[PDB]
Design a protein around this ligand. Structure first.
Ligand SMILES: Cc1cc2c(cc1C)N(C[C@H](O)[C@H](O)[C@H](O)COP(=O)(O)O)c1[nH]c(=O)[nH]c(=O)c1N2
Ligand SMILES: Cc1cc2c(cc1C)N(C[C@H](O)[C@H](O)[C@H](O)COP(=O)(O)O)c1[nH]c(=O)[nH]c(=O)c1N2
Lengths: 223, 223
């Protein structure tokens, strides 16, 4: 595929921040698996995959979220699939989660794990990740935006629209999910929302972005 | 139709955190412009595009960064193309850049810009973005990781290897770039690095991730 360039650019122009989805058109089991897999397979710093993807197909739960998710209301009402992306708190060489990742998932040699912890500690200080709990949590949250971008792009390539959403009352929504047993606020926070479905109509406004020369700069030979 | 699922899946298995690129294989200009466009066309919260992509092809500058970039050393030595992604500081409704984005790029109606500004404030308060300067910066940094994921996936769809990199001494690399007049530390921070090229060999270790059941949960009917 030498036209893969055109294929990719088509998808980045197809994707927009869809508010209104067609309530009749559902994303197939197979397509949504692909979308979910693109989050699961995403890269993450240290390979620590500090995320959870919660598919909220329950209408009454969506409605509860809508009342406190001003920026998500129409997407909650109409999206075929709606995804909460959690980010892990306290992702340190200390945590039981990280020990599980190194020993059980990544398959590190057990005798090296004390030294890897120290290396992790030093990186986190050298990058200011471990300055405070907010920085430590926001670092894991940055990794979930990698998966967020990958999921929307994968959806676009399949002809499926999406919408990322930060427009919700974080404290209130966190409390709703915590009291429902869905969000373990000791291990996670709610990082960002994303919706999937088929548009009801083409976007009435044109995509706007800054000019190439205002966001891109070369230092050295350009070719 | 559904040839595309497997193609997407192939690319997400093709991409890996490449440490050594083939120093004789260069990404084409056409292919790199597609990669760059995937960053420029990435979505961002409020459409504020709070990023800059700086391509460091100067090998002398690469070598200086390398001296304080433990996680990027081989990639700086060998990558065809090496990008620094900057994240903007102080992205609030009062800032000059946001004013530019509202009036010049998004071309909001002048008379109602007060209402736009006021919802920005409310939203940033509701999401704790404006709790402090650290939160404000890291929120913008979160947006750059969308562009990061998109550029790595785009490259992979093109058969091009990539590697994202946080493994550098934040403060020291910031001063180097600042002293050279590449990084204006009052407008930007150095968010993340990303390298592009062609693998020197197939990765020896199989890609590992948590199982689907461990990171994905459905609330409501599945299908
Ligand atoms: C992390 C994040 C969070 C949000 C958004 C984006 C991103 C990346 N944007 C969508 C934003 O307004 C939109 O992407 C851009 O303004 C317009 O560019 P596009 O239409 O996507 O090309 C968004 N849109 C919306 O209707 N409700 C919301 O709560 C949000 N929040
Ligand atoms: C934001 C971010 C930052 C980094 C990374 C990734 C991400 C997403 N990873 C690579 C990371 O270790 C790798 O993606 C996963 O651990 C392994 O899975 P993959 O090979 O990518 O599929 C990485 N790799 C490296 O050689 N030097 C580095 O400084 C970093 N830093």
């Amino acid at each position: 595929m030498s036209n893969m360039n055109q294929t990719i650019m088509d998808a980045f122009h197809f994707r927009h921040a869809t508010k209104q989805f067609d309530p009749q058109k559902k994303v197939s089991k197979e397509d949504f698996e692909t979308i979910l897999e693109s989050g699961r397979l995403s890269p993450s710093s240290l390979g620590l995959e500090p995320w959870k993807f919660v598919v909220i197909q329950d209408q009454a739960l969506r409605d509860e979220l809508k009342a406190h998710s001003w920026g998500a209301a129409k997407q909650l009402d109409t999206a075929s699939h709606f995804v909460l992306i959690f980010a892990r708190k306290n992702v340190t060489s200390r945590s039981p989660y990280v020990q599980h990742m190194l020993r059980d998932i990544k398959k590190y040699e057990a005798q090296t794990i004390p030294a890897v912890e120290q290396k992790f500690d030093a990186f986190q200080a050298d990058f200011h990740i471990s300055d405070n709990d907010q920085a430590l949590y926001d670092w894991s949250s940055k990794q979930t935006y990698i998966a967020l971008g990958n999921m929307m792009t994968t959806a676009a390539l399949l002809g499926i629209d999406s919408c990322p959403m930060e427009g919700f009352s974080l404290d209130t929504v966190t409390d709703i999910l915590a009291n429902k047993g869905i969000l373990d606020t000791e291990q996670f926070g709610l990082s960002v929302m994303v919706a999937f479905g088929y548009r009801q109509q083409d976007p009435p406004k044109n995509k706007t972005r800054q000019a190439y020369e205002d966001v891109i700069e070369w230092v050295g030979p350009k070719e």
